[PDB]
Design a protein around this motif. Structure first.
Motif, PDB file in Angstrom:
ATOM      1  N   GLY A 193       0.489  -1.934   0.074  1.00 15.73           N
ATOM      2  CA  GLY A 193      -0.142   0.186   0.184  1.00 15.73           C
ATOM      3  C   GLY A 193       1.036   1.199  -0.502  1.00 15.73           C
ATOM      4  O   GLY A 193       0.469   2.064  -0.031  1.00 15.73           O
ATOM      5  N   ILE A 224      -3.904   5.550  -2.632  1.00 16.20           N
ATOM      6  CA  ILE A 224      -5.237   5.272  -2.932  1.00 16.20           C
ATOM      7  C   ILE A 224      -6.357   5.263  -2.072  1.00 16.20           C
ATOM      8  O   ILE A 224      -7.131   5.951  -2.093  1.00 16.20           O
ATOM      9  N   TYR A 225      -5.666   4.409  -0.705  1.00 14.37           N
ATOM     10  CA  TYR A 225      -7.029   3.959  -0.419  1.00 14.37           C
ATOM     11  C   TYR A 225      -6.969   4.936   1.217  1.00 14.37           C
ATOM     12  O   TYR A 225      -7.988   5.029   2.178  1.00 14.37           O
ATOM     13  N   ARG A 226      -6.052   6.089   1.377  1.00 16.07           N
ATOM     14  CA  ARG A 226      -6.156   7.585   2.266  1.00 16.07           C
ATOM     15  C   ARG A 226      -7.353   8.958   1.108  1.00 16.07           C
ATOM     16  O   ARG A 226      -7.554   9.354   1.729  1.00 16.07           O
ATOM     17  N   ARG A 227      -6.975   8.155  -0.026  1.00 15.14           N
ATOM     18  CA  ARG A 227      -7.576   9.964  -0.649  1.00 15.14           C
ATOM     19  C   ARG A 227      -9.078  10.214  -1.320  1.00 15.14           C
ATOM     20  O   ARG A 227      -9.155  10.124  -1.550  1.00 15.14           O
ATOM     21  N   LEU A 228      -9.391   8.290  -1.168  1.00  9.77           N
ATOM     22  CA  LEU A 228     -10.788   8.334  -1.480  1.00  9.77           C
ATOM     23  C   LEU A 228     -11.750   8.530  -0.266  1.00  9.77           C
ATOM     24  O   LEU A 228     -11.444   8.206   0.858  1.00  9.77           O
ATOM     25  N   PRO A 229     -13.034   8.726  -0.049  1.00 10.28           N
ATOM     26  CA  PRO A 229     -13.482   9.065   1.411  1.00 10.28           C
ATOM     27  C   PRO A 229     -14.098   7.512   1.544  1.00 10.28           C
ATOM     28  O   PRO A 229     -14.392   6.636   0.983  1.00 10.28           O
ATOM     29  N   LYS A 230     -14.818   7.767   3.133  1.00  5.79           N
ATOM     30  CA  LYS A 230     -14.916   6.417   4.046  1.00  5.79           C
ATOM     31  C   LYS A 230     -16.443   6.766   3.165  1.00  5.79           C
ATOM     32  O   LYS A 230     -16.976   7.829   3.396  1.00  5.79           O
ATOM     33  N   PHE A 231     -17.008   5.437   3.225  1.00  2.00           N
ATOM     34  CA  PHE A 231     -18.577   5.427   3.360  1.00  2.00           C
ATOM     35  C   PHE A 231     -18.868   4.144   3.590  1.00  2.00           C
ATOM     36  O   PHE A 231     -18.539   3.076   3.990  1.00  2.00           O
ATOM     37  N   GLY A 232     -20.658   4.337   3.984  1.00  2.00           N
ATOM     38  CA  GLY A 232     -21.172   3.273   4.512  1.00  2.00           C
ATOM     39  C   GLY A 232     -21.148   2.333   6.308  1.00  2.00           C
ATOM     40  O   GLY A 232     -19.916   3.266   6.591  1.00  2.00           O
ATOM     41  N   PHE A 233     -21.901   2.172   6.035  1.00  2.00           N
ATOM     42  CA  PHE A 233     -22.399   2.044   7.839  1.00  2.00           C
ATOM     43  C   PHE A 233     -22.804  -0.229   7.888  1.00  2.00           C
ATOM     44  O   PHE A 233     -23.157  -0.577   6.773  1.00  2.00           O
ATOM     45  N   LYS A 260     -12.383   0.374   4.998  1.00  6.08           N
ATOM     46  CA  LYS A 260     -13.796   0.911   5.312  1.00  6.08           C
ATOM     47  C   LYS A 260     -14.073   1.938   4.065  1.00  6.08           C
ATOM     48  O   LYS A 260     -15.485   2.802   3.925  1.00  6.08           O
ATOM     49  N   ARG A 261     -13.501   1.583   2.898  1.00  2.00           N
ATOM     50  CA  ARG A 261     -13.279   2.679   1.622  1.00  2.00           C
ATOM     51  C   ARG A 261     -14.063   1.812   0.562  1.00  2.00           C
ATOM     52  O   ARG A 261     -13.809   1.536  -0.339  1.00  2.00           O
ATOM     53  N   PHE A 262     -13.585   0.394   0.448  1.00  2.00           N
ATOM     54  CA  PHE A 262     -14.134  -0.313  -0.222  1.00  2.00           C
ATOM     55  C   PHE A 262     -15.064  -1.656  -0.258  1.00  2.00           C
ATOM     56  O   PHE A 262     -15.116  -2.160   1.298  1.00  2.00           O
ATOM     57  N   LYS A 263     -15.456  -2.146  -1.335  1.00  7.36           N
ATOM     58  CA  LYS A 263     -16.796  -3.113  -1.030  1.00  7.36           C
ATOM     59  C   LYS A 263     -16.703  -3.690  -2.098  1.00  7.36           C
ATOM     60  O   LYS A 263     -16.197  -4.078  -3.201  1.00  7.36           O
ATOM     61  N   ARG A 277     -16.990  16.929  -0.778  1.00  4.76           N
ATOM     62  CA  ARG A 277     -16.972  17.343   0.629  1.00  4.76           C
ATOM     63  C   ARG A 277     -18.015  18.135   1.013  1.00  4.76           C
ATOM     64  O   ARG A 277     -18.915  18.717   1.339  1.00  4.76           O
ATOM     65  N   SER A 304      -3.546  -3.939  -5.879  1.00  3.06           N
ATOM     66  CA  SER A 304      -3.042  -3.448  -4.442  1.00  3.06           C
ATOM     67  C   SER A 304      -4.242  -3.781  -3.433  1.00  3.06           C
ATOM     68  O   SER A 304      -4.222  -4.431  -2.403  1.00  3.06           O
ATOM     69  N   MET A 334      -4.149  -5.689   0.045  1.00  2.00           N
ATOM     70  CA  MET A 334      -4.632  -4.882   1.191  1.00  2.00           C
ATOM     71  C   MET A 334      -5.767  -5.334   2.116  1.00  2.00           C
ATOM     72  O   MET A 334      -6.311  -5.215   3.502  1.00  2.00           O
TER      73      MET A 334
END
Lengths: 96, 63, 77, 48
Positions: free
Chosen positions: A2, A10-19, B11-14, B28, B55, B59
């Motif tokens: 990563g 990539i995993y930090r420049r995209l927003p969190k979403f969902g619960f 938390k960002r990928f599904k 935002r 990647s 991860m």
RNA sequence: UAUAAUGGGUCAGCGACUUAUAUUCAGUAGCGAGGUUAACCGUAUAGGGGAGCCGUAGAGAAAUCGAGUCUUAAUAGGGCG
RNA sequence: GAACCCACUGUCGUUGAAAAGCCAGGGGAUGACUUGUGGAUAGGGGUGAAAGGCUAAUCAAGCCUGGUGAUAGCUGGUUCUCCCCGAAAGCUAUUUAGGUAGCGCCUCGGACGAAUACCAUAGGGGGUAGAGCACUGUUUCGGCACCGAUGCAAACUCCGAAUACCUAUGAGUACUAUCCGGGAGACAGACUGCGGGUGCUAACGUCCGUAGUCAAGAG
RNA sequence: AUAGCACUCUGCAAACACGAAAGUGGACGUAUAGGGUGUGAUGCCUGCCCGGUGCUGGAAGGUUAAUUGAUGGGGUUAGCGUAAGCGAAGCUCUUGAUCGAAGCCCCAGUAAACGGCGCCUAAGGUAGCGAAAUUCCUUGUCGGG
RNA sequence: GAUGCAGUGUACCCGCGGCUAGACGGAAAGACCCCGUGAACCUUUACUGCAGCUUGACACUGAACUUUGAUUGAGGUUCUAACUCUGUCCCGUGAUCCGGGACGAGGACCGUGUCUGGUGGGUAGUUUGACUGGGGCGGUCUCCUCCUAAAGAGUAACGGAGGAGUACGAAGGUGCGCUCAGCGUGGUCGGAAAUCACGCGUAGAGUAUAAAGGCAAAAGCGCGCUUAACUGCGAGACCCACAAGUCGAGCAGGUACGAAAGUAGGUCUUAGUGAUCCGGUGGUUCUGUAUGGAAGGGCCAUCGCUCAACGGAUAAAAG
């Protein structure tokens, strides 16, 4: 892994979403064909757990049209979709 | 030991049938200057690019 | 001392994307132009940034026409 | 500088647009007719 | 790099990609819409043990629905199947 | 001025007689003097008429053991044989510039089947070489700010090639072209020819595009 | 380093230092004594500046820490009503009226405190010395050797 | 910078004494210089913490009298019983410690615990960017336009030359309507240069802003009505390592202008900008840990400080 040389990953420049939903972790999905594993004509949560098509900690289950059946099945306490209900009635079983 | 997930990436990928879905950034806070078509089009979910799927798989060993 | 220069803007990739004699479908972009070096003929639309696109399926053709000699691009069905 | 302002629907649906204004040239509040999707009808939007 | 760049006075002996666990791919073998046990019991590589895991269905943030589903006023159009 | 204490000059010694000395000279020598035996102060502490001096031949933080196999984008080394294919020293980003990640370039397996290449013919846009003064600018000689001759220009153009690029059709010669997946290496390049910036139309100089060779190739 | 000189602190259960405490030194001393700081026998002497920082004294005019707690809004709960979606006690979530010292602000003194000594400022060098361990031009210029 | 390469010159084989011109001679993985997101120690008005000192509230902590403020608050004078004595005497006791008893001097003070404001290089952990014709000082780091750029795209240097970190409820939409600028002749205080009549050639004017590419259906200029500066989308293509970016016919719903065909999803275009985390506001047929709620979370729209070293080490940092 990563790490990409210093620029924002990539995993930090995209927003969190969902619960997360808890009831989904206890809901169970069942194929129509899997009913062949059940001994007897009664379909229920207990009989499904006995046949090992549902985990012992689930509280509700649903049946979907995925395969085929040949024996008659009287279904009790299990949610039935339109196609699954049609298939059961064609096979000659009843609901409730 | 057992492999561990990167919870931040989880938390960002599904998970989808044949890939991974994500949302889009740049939506935002600073939004007044953005045009209506931009606002609409950046709405929704898109697919992860092939160059990044490897990647993402590393991860997220399980999802 | 120092230098007062050393600034430039990023490239914009302008030019003719589809040449004459080719087959295009509706929506295809034909010319990326800062100004109107080429003008829209039959079955050709103009964008808000002076882009030229095809509004029908056919074959591209360039012509010179008019009093001013304006260059035109059109699509033959 | 130009301040950012919010126009709210008169119908009370809660819908609002956003824009920018210059106070000196427009000291007073701004009212303009616009479309309200919640009621699917044009109404008067008034500055917040 | 003949380099006037580094290392070696010589001989004999020793000296560097391993092991445990988890996961993905390939080859091969059993079974096959099914496959497989763990701890444990066991005069013990046998036999018993089905809790559990993987596959068999997706869409959606979720409720929910289901060969469909989300978005929308839309049995439009579009995304994913 | 002897003993005792000290160490100012010079010679020799520097794998020495000696891990700090000898020889010849030199300073103090009743004092803030020299010295024996025993005892106290312990490491971010002690002691210091103060040089960061001394604290067991070790001091800008003693020594021994343990954490401990500390970390090291760094330097070094990595052992038997044969066959096939075979790179790069580029772009983008970076607390980055001798590291790393995606793409480009290598190899192996699966799907696939000319959809690929060379050449010929047909169609197409251009603003470079050259040339020119009709715009912009600049230059010389003449006649009434204008006019007639006259020259120049990367950021001037009334003009304008050869090449190069894109599409379609076609003969022949060539297992080509695309997609999915396993494994990498590499991101310090050098010279020469052609078109240029920079420099002095200097550099085995430096920075770009393009082609050949070395790199990784002997005769 | 030194005898000498000056500034400053300490009234004794002294200041100061060591230690985690108990306690110990200072000292079985008592301001003529003890600690710190600077200068450095001796002769002649030791100029100006309190604007800055520090120290000393006063003022109490302004600011808020804990604490305290007036009020304000909200969750739930009771009771009427075919019908209005009305709506309390208690429990409880949150808000911060007021009270509140120091510090800071302000005034004055202090330079043998740290410091400064060119129309402007706190004020622009008194004695003494000077190509001087301090002078770049500089092997400045004149005399002696 | 050659005993070992090419050409050429000289030279029978081996010791001993002496010498130091060369073997880039020996010795010590250069201390000078630069790099590593290495180390140590020191300084401070670098960042951040702690010891020490210092302020106040509660507790240990009491009593009697006195004056003043809104049953209660604040001061002053006294007292002894908590408590202090590194003060005298008695005993344990043969004793300069300690313990108990008597007295004396103090006394609700001083002092200690919890909380809390200020000070704090005494001490401790750290930080103090990159490019660069070596490094330092100087200059630059993001976006737009032209040349270099070799007639598709793209293409470097601390190469040449300039702009940007906005403006506008009309400077937007639509119906209708109009063309600039310089020249030559006559007129009021008006002439190099003001307003106005006609005439010759001619786009050389203008287009909010830098330049390039454009501009007659003018994209330049004026008037009347207006808010399409809309909602849900979107066939198809351009560009691109990703994250990103750009153009767009057409469908459904409301709308403005026009008699009508029809035009309008901001402005002639290309700069006027910032990801993710945290936090704020409005709505939400979502969720909401026994149940009904609520709190909290998700979703749609939108807002704020910083990141200009402008893909943004932890929104905290020098020598």
């Amino acid at each position: 892994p990563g790490f990409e040389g210093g620029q924002t990953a990539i995993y930090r420049r995209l927003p969190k979403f969902g619960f997360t939903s808890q009831i989904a972790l206890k809901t169970a999905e069942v194929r129509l064909s899997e009913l062949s594993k059940v001994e007897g004509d009664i379909v229920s949560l207990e009989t499904l757990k006995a046949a090992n098509v549902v985990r012992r900690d689930q509280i509700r289950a649903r049946i979907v049209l995925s395969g085929e059946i040949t024996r008659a099945f009287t279904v009790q306490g299990v949610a039935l979709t339109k196609g699954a209900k049609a298939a059961i009635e064609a096979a000659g079983g009843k609901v409730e | 030991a057992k492999l561990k997930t990167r919870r931040g990436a989880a938390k960002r990928f599904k998970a989808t049938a044949n890939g991974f879905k994500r949302k889009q950034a740049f939506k935002r806070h600073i939004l007044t200057k953005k045009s209506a078509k931009r606002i609409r089009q950046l709405r929704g979910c898109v697919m992860v690019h092939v160059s990044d799927v490897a990647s993402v798989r590393r991860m997220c060993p399980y999802i | 001392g120092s230098t007062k220069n050393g600034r430039d803007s990023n490239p914009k990739m302008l030019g003719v994307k589809v040449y004459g004699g080719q087959t295009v479908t509706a929506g295809n972009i034909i010319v990326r132009q800062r100004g109107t070096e080429f003008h829209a003929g039959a079955n050709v639309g103009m964008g808000r940034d002076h882009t030229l696109f095809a509004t029908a399926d056919g074959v591209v053709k360039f012509e010179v026409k008019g009093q001013f000699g304006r260059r035109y691009v059109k699509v033959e069905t | 500088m130009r301040d950012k302002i919010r126009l709210v629907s008169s119908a009370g649906t809660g819908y609002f647009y956003t824009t920018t204004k210059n106070k000196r040239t427009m000291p007073e509040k701004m009212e303009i007719k616009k479309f309200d999707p919640k009621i699917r009808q044009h109404v008067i939007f008034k500055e917040a």
